[PDB]
Design a protein around this ligand. Structure first.
Ligand code: ATP
Ligand code: ATP
Ligand code: ATP
Ligand code: MG
Ligand code: MG
Ligand code: MG
Lengths: 240, 470, 55, 478, 250, 121
């Protein structure tokens, strides 16, 4: 597949979309065949040449002066261990990463993207603007504080938190629920049609949530909606 | 020919070379019998078990005893069959080792007695009984809340000093009395003083006349510690294969069997498994447990005590062992110190047979109601510890009133306990105890004092005791 | 005075419940840690065994 | 001929391989050219693997190995009494050679299931807490477990010293300690007079791993001689953890695969073989007995460790020493809550048994109510009984170093504690009260002491009470 | 042949035929279609075998062949299962393949392939087949035994490197064939046993990564009266909507 | 260094002090040498001969009739873990132990010796 994409990049100078369904299977098959080639085992059972073999393939997927290739790769994490060598060594080969979590999947908040572990190199004030950057950083800070508060909430009760921490929890639960979305391809699983939300709408909605405008709405009204308005109509349908 | 010689000795592992075309089969027994030719030798009488065929007419074997004194080139003779141990009436009341040699001082069994191979394929799919049947132990709690199954495996858990040995003796007594069967005890990898104490306890109780014992304790080599379970198991198999009886088989610690298997695999040189166990752990557990089954003419049911390393039930050995258990009983030290005997934790004990299709709708309903009442009383004790008895409603008062009598009625007088209680024992039918518990739940005996239920057999004995008391 | 006594009793019961909850969390976390580290130990043993075999 | 001689073809890490030795026996002792001993462990097809029992730096490839014709064994006999010796039977204190004329193999079968008898004879250790809470009988194997510097060695030395007038032979095995520490232990034993019946086996940290692995087995072999002659023997193992470390070293050098937690798979078998040889013999085998006190060191009191769990599963009981109690001034540091002896209790004397029950209840009650001492209240439920009696019990259970006391005196003092005779005495004066009471007994209670010593039972209660009151009359509180 | 290639991309069709198991907790929110593969995962004594037997029994009035493969089960348990099938009338269309725990590891490793090969005949004749694998975990244990007996280096949890390939090769062969291939289908219901409900273990994750959804049965819910013990959070059906009738989907 | 120190007591009867910079690095070097020689690793990757090497080093530091050698040794503790084999195996050879705390160091209290954890016979 990469050989085809490389020709389309070079010999015609055209923009190429490259989707790889699971790049982990390449290294998995390499590890499976390594033992019969006379190589000694390394790390938890992987081949000694794990890094070089991965690099030789990954470095060919790049944008050049005569053509740009944007590639989206799904990477499988064995046993949900992010410290496994195959997921670990492939982190350095990516510009933007999104990490999914089974904990978020169990809660029903799809696409279950981890808001903290997910990183990108385009999140800079000179690239997305201060308006976007401040909102993103504030959302991350609030979510981190809510994550930290879990132990003290569990072992002391909700009523023992200060009015600042109570407001932090109140905002963070709504933000976490609003991070969920209904997908077009998800219509086969649930009857909801799905939606497409522009970046301006997302930024405005999250800024309004952070400003405290929607503190009176119920928590579940924010789950699986599009723009911030659909929260209002969902609350009205529920009877506010 | 049938004669070979030793070429390698490495601890318990011995390699024996035979003539071409005359190798012994796997699991066969080889005998080494040597007399010291001069002052630099010692007398040797050792038995080996064939494990692998290494090629070049060489066989790798494991010894059943210490190999010290062996010299390369000693003659080895093949018996042409696996290890054989005596079976029949002669085994009852005796104590044996892994090789079937009597440890007691009563004398050796004559060579004309019947002997059966230790290794045997499991009974076929045709031979097994198509019906699940309940083994009536005669103990009220076991028959009510954790019923046993003919051909089933039961795990026995409890702390020290709670009465596991007394319960074992009572089970043997009840089975040999009512069902006409016998019992076999195999204490694998445990304390020699504990085995001696158990022997003396059986001799005191008179149970020893109906049981056979094989020990192969901790000091024994791993091969003996692994094959003691199998020799006891085949001694148990004989009685139900020929005479068609129901037989109890007791294993003091099944974990030591797997540990000895792991040690033997390490000696053989096989690559260790996940947590250092042998790769054949599940397989060996299969050949061991699959022979304890119920068939069309008899059954063997086994009571096994299982050690859990580091209290982790997810450890591979407990995980493999638990896949075969059909019931579980837990001895409870709090009940023991409270004075309830047997103290077998009615809430914690579980059984697979406790279903309406197997034990009956009425029995299942009575058991579930008793369990719910006991759980409700357990919850209520916390509120008692906080507010006191008087604050609870009359419904809670009635629940406590019923629960105390139920818990006391769970106790029973054992036949073996007479030696230090004076009172004789009693055998309670399952229908009788179900009827008694149903009548107690109906409130037909609420007016009686709670102490009349303390330690009693059938429900009629309860009212007789109350009438005699006052 | 009665309100002060009630306040002291409420603080008593609240702190007792907090200690109970914290001890429950301690037990659960210690169990999780002990179950977790043995897997790493066994993985190290497996790596040693494989390295010895490969030579 | 190459049948009785051989040549070394490989040397490394204390392990050697030799060509030849066609008639060598498995487990035999072999002799090198320079006099160093060795064990024939693996009889491979064309060579023999030898474990070197000494300094292997003097052995080169190509030197001759001499056969000895004897399975490994150690010298035994009464001539070993009062000497410190290595695991191979070679003296290390000088004083000339040991002139024994009998040997016994190191690896021997344990007594059979029909050769044993129930334990029924008390073992007086001279420690109040041990003799009260966790009684030990002759033939029992009791584990002593604790952290570093918790007094395990002190307890062992006190127990050994207390056997001065008892008809018991003591064997002390030092495994992996400092040679200076072993020397100091020997000096204390000589000063207190315990060398008249004590054999000391030493294997310092500088010695090769096989010597550390073999030392306790040599001690058992020495003890079994007196055991089968009808005598009573006490054996103390100072580091089963260091034995396990040495055996793991040897196994790894032999390239055997590791087992659970990097220890060899048969680390349980190693300890079971050693501890299973202590028993009480039946009358058909004579009245002899052997009792063992293995030692295990924990990490921050982690009882759930692999070696502590194995030794607990093997032994008949445990005695736990706590570092916090040791630091808090309770030098005995015995935790009565976790310590337990299960074979013991039947061997305890009647007089001591009649008071141990009350002592246990008082100490236990104090042990769940000490933490509430931040504010003493609730009257008798906390203050007058639980806080007072428990503190006095803790005061009386303390004991000075190397001062064991007779069981009769222990019975007297603990009866005085339990019957409330110490309720008026302040806590600071309790130890002085006990010390003066011992002298008052030695001066005026010979009848009571003789009655207890001859009947193993308490004397007349009225006479005992009047004697205690008579003593309390003369005591001055300060 | 035991080793046979799986149907290709162009030999398959989208799943559109519901498989009614007769259980509300499955048919409502974890639908199963013909040609789908759906594992039942949970701790021991949770009702997985009961669910499988009820699913087999419910197919009495439909023209579909059922195959029950027992891997590592007790012979008495297999005998009782066969007796229940005979009582309820499922033996008229059911094939039982057994490999008890006393059998050697090769037979345990080989049994599921024998079952799927038996089902392939009816699938390619144009009929519908349902296949049940009773312990893929025990199959994996037997394969690990064999691999370490062959001295192949062990990976995570001492399992061989091709442990994922072992299960994927078997489970990938169940498919819904197209009209050109005859419209046959093979439905697979593999089983995985977890330890203390740990769904993050290597074998459970490997088997989940292959199939089209999982039914997670929780012991904490099996106790305290919720007998089906369906865990909606951890359960999912990847052929949802299409595997239901219009009313139930609505 | 030990060989250089032993002379002043063996041939002159002096009382000598021997200072060792770090025993942890000595154990690390021993483990590296064992790995180079190809021996199977110990508990956490150390050499199987760790205890024997420790005993061989420490046992020569003793007091005799002619003189004595007292030794002060600094022990590094990786990640506060005192259960690590290198800190653990050296405890059996020490007469007195001194513990230093970064918590006390940051407060400005030097030498930052913990007054409750330090022990001496
Ligand atoms: N049915 C009973 N009735 C009365 N007392 C009993 C009964 N069963 C046991 N006991 C008491 O409990 C004690 C413990 O009995 P036993 O030795 O059988 O327990 P155990 O749990 O097997 O012990 P251990 O694990 O220490 O070997 C008995 O000595 C007796 O005093
Ligand atoms: N009852 C006691 N009274 C006074 N000092 C005591 C008492 N018991 C022990 N000690 C002292 O406490 C210290 C503990 O040393 P000891 O050798 O007895 O302990 P250990 O637990 O065996 O430790 P180690 O691991 O150092 O061998 C010694 O200085 C000893 O003299
Ligand atoms: N829906 C149900 N209602 C009532 N009882 C049920 C139900 N489902 C299962 N059970 C009962 O639960 C028990 C265990 O069920 P089952 O044997 O199917 O479980 P399993 O997970 O396959 O067990 P194992 O690991 O022993 O093979 C049986 O007694 C069965 O009768
Ligand atoms: Mg018992
Ligand atoms: Mg000491
Ligand atoms: Mg099942």
């Amino acid at each position: 597949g990469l050989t085809m994409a490389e020709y389309f990049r070079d010999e015609q100078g055209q923009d190429v979309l490259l989707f790889i369904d699971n790049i982990f299977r390449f290294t998995q098959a390499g590890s499976e065949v390594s033992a019969l080639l006379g190589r000694m085992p390394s790390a938890v059972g992987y081949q000694p040449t794990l890094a070089t073999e991965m690099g030789q393939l990954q470095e060919r997927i790049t944008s050049t002066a005569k053509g740009s290739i944007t590639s989206i790769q799904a990477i499988y994490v064995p046993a949900d261990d992010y410290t496994d060598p195959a997921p670990a060594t492939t982190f350095s080969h990516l510009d933007a990463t999104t990490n999914l979590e089974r904990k978020l999947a169990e809660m029903g908040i799809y696409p279950a993207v981890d808001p903290l572990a997910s990183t990108s190199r385009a999140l800079a004030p000179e690239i997305v603007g201060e308006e976007h950057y401040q909102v993103a950083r504030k959302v991350q800070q609030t979510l981190q504080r809510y994550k930290e508060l879990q132990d003290i909430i569990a072992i002391l009760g909700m009523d023992e938190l200060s009015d600042e921490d109570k407001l932090v929890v109140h905002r963070a639960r709504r933000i976490q629920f609003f991070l969920s979305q209904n997908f077009h391809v998800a219509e086969q699983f649930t009857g909801q049609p799905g939606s497409y939300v522009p970046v301006k709408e997302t930024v405005r909605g999250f800024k309004e949530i952070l400003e405290g405008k929607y503190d009176h709405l119920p928590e579940d009204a924010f789950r699986l909606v599009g723009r911030i308005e659909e929260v209002v109509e969902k609350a009205k349908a529920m009877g506010v | 020919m049938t004669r070979g010689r030793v070429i390698q000795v490495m601890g318990p592992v011995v390699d024996v070379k035979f003539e071409n075309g005359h190798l012994p089969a796997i699991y066969n027994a080889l005998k080494i019998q040597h007399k010291a030719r001069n002052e630099n030798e010692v007398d040797i009488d050792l038995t080996l078990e064939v494990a692998l065929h290494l090629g070049d007419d060489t066989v790798r074997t494991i010894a059943m005893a210490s190999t010290d004194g062996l010299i390369r080139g000693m003659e080895v003779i093949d018996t042409g069959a696996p290890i054989s141990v005596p079976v029949g009436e002669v085994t009852l009341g005796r104590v044996f080792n892994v090789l079937g040699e009597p440890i007691d001082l009563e004398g050796d069994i004559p060579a004309d007695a019947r002997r059966d191979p230790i290794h045997r394929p499991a009974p076929k799919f045709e031979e097994l009984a198509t019906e699940v049947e309940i083994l009536e132990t005669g103990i009220k709690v076991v028959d009510l809340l954790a019923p046993y199954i003919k051909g089933g495996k039961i795990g026995l858990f409890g702390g020290a000093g709670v009465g596991k040995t007394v319960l074992i003796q009572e089970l043997i007594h009840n089975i040999a009395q009512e069902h006409g069967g016998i019992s076999v005890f195999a204490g694998v990898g445990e304390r020699t003083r504990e085995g001696n104490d158990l022997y003396h306890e059986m001799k005191d109780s008179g149970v020893i006349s109906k049981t056979a014992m094989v020990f192969g304790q901790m000091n024994e080599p791993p091969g003996a510690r692994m094959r003691v379970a199998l020799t006891g198991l085949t001694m148990a198999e004989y009685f139900r294969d020929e005479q068609g009886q129901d037989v109890l088989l007791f294993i003091d610690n099944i974990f030591r069997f797997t540990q000895a298997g792991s040690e033997v695999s390490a000696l053989l040189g096989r690559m260790p498994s996940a947590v250092g166990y042998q790769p054949t752990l599940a397989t060996e557990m299969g050949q061991l447990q699959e022979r304890i089954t119920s068939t069309a003419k008899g059954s063997i049911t086994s009571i096994q005590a299982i050690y859990v390393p580091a209290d982790d039930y997810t450890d591979p050995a407990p995980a493999t062992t638990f896949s075969h258990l059909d019931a579980t009983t837990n001895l409870e030290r709090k009940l023991a110190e409270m004075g309830i005997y047997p103290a077998v934790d009615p809430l914690a004990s579980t059984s697979r047979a406790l279903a309406p299709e197997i034990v009956g709708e009425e029995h299942y309903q009575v058991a579930r109601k008793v369990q719910q009442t006991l759980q409700r009383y357990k919850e209520l004790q916390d509120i008692i510890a906080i507010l006191g008895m008087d604050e609870l409603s009359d419904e809670d008062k009635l629940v406590v009133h019923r629960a105390r009598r139920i818990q006391f009625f769970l106790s029973q007088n054992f036949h073996v306990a007479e030696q230090f209680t004076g009172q004789p024992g009693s055998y309670v039918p399952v229908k009788e105890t179900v009827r008694g518990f149903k009548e107690i739940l109906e409130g037909k005996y609420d007016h009686l004092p709670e102490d009349a239920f303390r330690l009693v057999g059938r429900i009629e004995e309860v009212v007789e005791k109350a009438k005699a008391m006052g | 005075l009665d309100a002060k006594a009630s306040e002291h009793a409420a603080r008593m019961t609240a702190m007792k419940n907090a200690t109970d909850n914290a001890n429950e969390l301690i037990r659960t976390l210690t169990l999780s840690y002990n179950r977790a580290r043995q897997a790493a130990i066994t993985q190290e043993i497996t790596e040693i065994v494989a390295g010895a075999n490969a030579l | 001929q190459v049948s009785d001689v051989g040549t070394v073809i490989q040397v490394g890490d204390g392990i050697a391989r030799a060509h030849g030795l066609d008639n060598v026996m498995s487990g035999e002792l072999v002799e090198f050219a320079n006099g160093v001993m060795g064990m024939a462990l693996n009889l491979e097809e064309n060579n023999v693997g030898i474990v070197i029992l000494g300094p292997y730096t003097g052995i080169k490839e190509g030197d001759e190995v001499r056969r000895t014709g004897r399975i490994m064994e150690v010298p035994v006999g009464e001539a070993l009494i009062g000497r410190v010796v290595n695991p191979l039977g070679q003296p290390v204190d000088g004083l000339g050679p040991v002139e024994t004329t009998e040997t016994r193999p190191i690896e021997s079968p344990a007594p059979g299931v029909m050769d044993r008898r129930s334990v029924h004879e008390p073992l007086q250790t001279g420690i109040k807490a041990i003799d009260a809470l966790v009684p030990i009988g002759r033939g029992q194997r009791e584990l002593i477990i604790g952290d570093r510097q918790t007094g395990k060695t002190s307890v062992a030395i006190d127990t050994i010293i207390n056997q001065k007038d008892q008809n018991m032979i003591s064997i002390y095995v030092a495994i992996g300690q400092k040679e200076s520490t072993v020397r100091t232990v020997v000096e204390t034993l000589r000063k207190h007079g315990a060398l008249d019946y004590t054999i000391v086996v030493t294997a310092s940290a500088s010695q090769p791993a096989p010597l550390l692995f073999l030392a306790p087995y040599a001690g058992v072999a020495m003890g079994e001689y007196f055991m089968y002659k009808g005598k009573h023997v006490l054996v103390v193992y100072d580091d089963l953890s260091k034995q396990a470390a040495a055996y793991r070293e040897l196994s790894l050098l032999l390239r055997r695969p590791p087992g659970r937690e990097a220890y060899p798979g048969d680390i349980f078998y190693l300890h079971s073989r050693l501890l299973e040889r202590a028993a009480k013999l039946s009358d058909a085998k004579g009245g002899g007995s052997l009792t063992a006190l293995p030692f295990v060191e924990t990490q921050a009191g982690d009882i759930s460790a692999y070696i502590p769990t194995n030794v607990i599963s093997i032994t008949d009981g445990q005695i736990f020493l706590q570092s916090d109690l040791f630091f808090s001034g309770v030098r005995p540091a015995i935790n009565a809550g976790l310590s337990v002896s299960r074979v013991g209790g039947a061997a305890q004397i009647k007089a001591m048994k009649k008071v141990a029950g009350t002592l246990r209840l008082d100490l236990a009650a104090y042990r769940e109510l000490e933490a509430f001492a931040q504010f003493g209240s609730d009257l008798d439920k906390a203050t007058q009984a639980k806080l007072a009696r428990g503190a006095r019990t803790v005061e009386v259970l303390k004991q000075d170093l190397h001062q064991p006391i007779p069981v009769e005196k222990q019975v007297l003092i603990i009866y005085a504690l339990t019957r409330g005779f110490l309720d008026d005495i302040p806590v600071e004066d309790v130890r002085r009260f006990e010390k003066e009471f011992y002298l008052f007994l030695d001066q005026n209670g010979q009848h009571l002491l003789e009655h207890i010593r001859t009947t193993k039972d308490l004397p007349n209660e009225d006479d005992l009470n009047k004697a205690i009151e008579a003593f309390k009359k003369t005591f001055v509180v300060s």
